[PDB]
Amino acid sequence: SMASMKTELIRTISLYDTIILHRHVRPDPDAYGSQCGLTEILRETYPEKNIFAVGTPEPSLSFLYSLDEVDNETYEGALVIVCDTANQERIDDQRYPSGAKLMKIDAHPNEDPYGDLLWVDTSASSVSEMIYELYLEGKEHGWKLNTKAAELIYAGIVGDTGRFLFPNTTEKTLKYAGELIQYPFSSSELFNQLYETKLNVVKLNGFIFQNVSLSENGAASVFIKKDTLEKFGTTASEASQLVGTLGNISGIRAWVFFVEEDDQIRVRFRSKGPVINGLARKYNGGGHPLASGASIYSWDEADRILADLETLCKE
Numbered sequence: 073s074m075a076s077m078k079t080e081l082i083r084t085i086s087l088y089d090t091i092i093l094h095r096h097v098r099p100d101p102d103a104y105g106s107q108c109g110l111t112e113i114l115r116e117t118y119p120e121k122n123i124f125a126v127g128t129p130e131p132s133l134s135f136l137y138s139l140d141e142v143d144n145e146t147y148e149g150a151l152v153i154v155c156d157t158a159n160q161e162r163i164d165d166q167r168y169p170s171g172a173k174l175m176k177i178d179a180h181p182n183e184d185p186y187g188d189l190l191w192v193d194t195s196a197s198s199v200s201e202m203i204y205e206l207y208l209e210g211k212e213h214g215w216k217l218n219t220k221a222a223e224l225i226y227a228g229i230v231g232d233t234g235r236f237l238f239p240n241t242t243e244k245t246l247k248y249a250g251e252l253i254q255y256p257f258s259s260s261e262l263f264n265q266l267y268e269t270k271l272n273v274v275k276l277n278g279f280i281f282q283n284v285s286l287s288e289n290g291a292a293s294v295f296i297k298k299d300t301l302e303k304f305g306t307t308a309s310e311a312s313q314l315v316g317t318l319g320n321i322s323g324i325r326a327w328v329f330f331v332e333e334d335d336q337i338r339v340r341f342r343s344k345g346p347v348i349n350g351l352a353r354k355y356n357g358g359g360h361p362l363a364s365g366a367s368i369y370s371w372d373e374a375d376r377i378l379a380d381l382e383t384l385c386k387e
């Protein structure tokens with residue numbers, strides 16, 4: 073059961089003098105909220121321990137918490153905890169298996185079941201929610217949550233659920249958010265910093281909004297070629313990140329972005345209903361029923377994708 077695993081995690085954390093926490097490369101709010109929220113619980117609870125959070129900062133999330141630089145030596149005999157990383161190959165700072173122990177905490181399917189102690193709960197909204205849950209048990213072992221830690225966990229939850237929009241939001245998620253918002257951090261300032269968007273990514277989004285084609289069957293497309301990328305000064309990853317912004321257009325059922333890179337065209341599939349991971353598979357990609365991707369090599373293939381998207385949507 074989960075109750076037995078949370079208790080073992082807390083017992084194990086108790087034992088180690090030095091604890092170092094990692095999360096995934098290209099961190100998002102949930103990576104910061106889980107890794108740093110837990111770091112901050114442990115610092116507040118165990119002033120005697122040496123606690124570090126490692127990885128390269130994301131400049132847009134750098135306002136939540138600052139990270140540590142640590143020597144290889146520091147790992148000797150350390151407990152290493154990795155948050156919110158489904159695949160060990162995607163862990164930021166690849167020193168994670170070099171301590172005396174390895175603990176994995178994640179909310180994604182346990183396809184890569186690494187670690188000496190594993191707690192993976194796919195029912196959880198986010199790993200930040202999992203950290204709050206662990207704190208609730210830890211409370212009975214003397215754990216203490218301060219204002220910074222509450223703020224971090226709240227940022228993670230709010231980030232990962234699109235502010236209680238997405239289907240990973242549950243009754244627990246909202247309950248815990250109401251407990252967290254009782255701490256005296258400014259929710260409005262947090263939101264303001266999390267949602268701050270570079271002007272040129274804004275302008276690119278406006279190009280995307282003006283240039284979206286919607287068929288009578290609810291199929292939509294946006295082409296983002298090198299010329300457009302260059303005009304707005306936006307990277308291809310910035311463009312791809314905007315794929316979710318079409319979600320509310322009236323009548324939209326499924327859609328694709330085609331984002332040109334140097335050695336491939338990235339394809340990002342999104343849907344309101346009709347399953348699109350087969351379509352991504354058909355073109356050598358894959359992913360979730362409602363969010364998938366592929367990589368193609370000509371504009372001719374893109375037109376084939378479109379055609380297939382019209383068909384799927386029309387059924």
Ligand SMILES: Nc1ncnc2c1ncn2[C@@H]1O[C@H](COP(=O)(O)O)[C@@H](O)[C@H]1O
Nearest residue numbers: 340341357358359360363364365366367
């Ligand atoms: N080329 C690809 N091959 C396989 N899976 C992919 C590919 N691109 C995206 N995905 C998956 O599709 C889902 C949506 O991610 P993405 O659209 O890349 O942001 C995730 O589960 C990705 O791992």
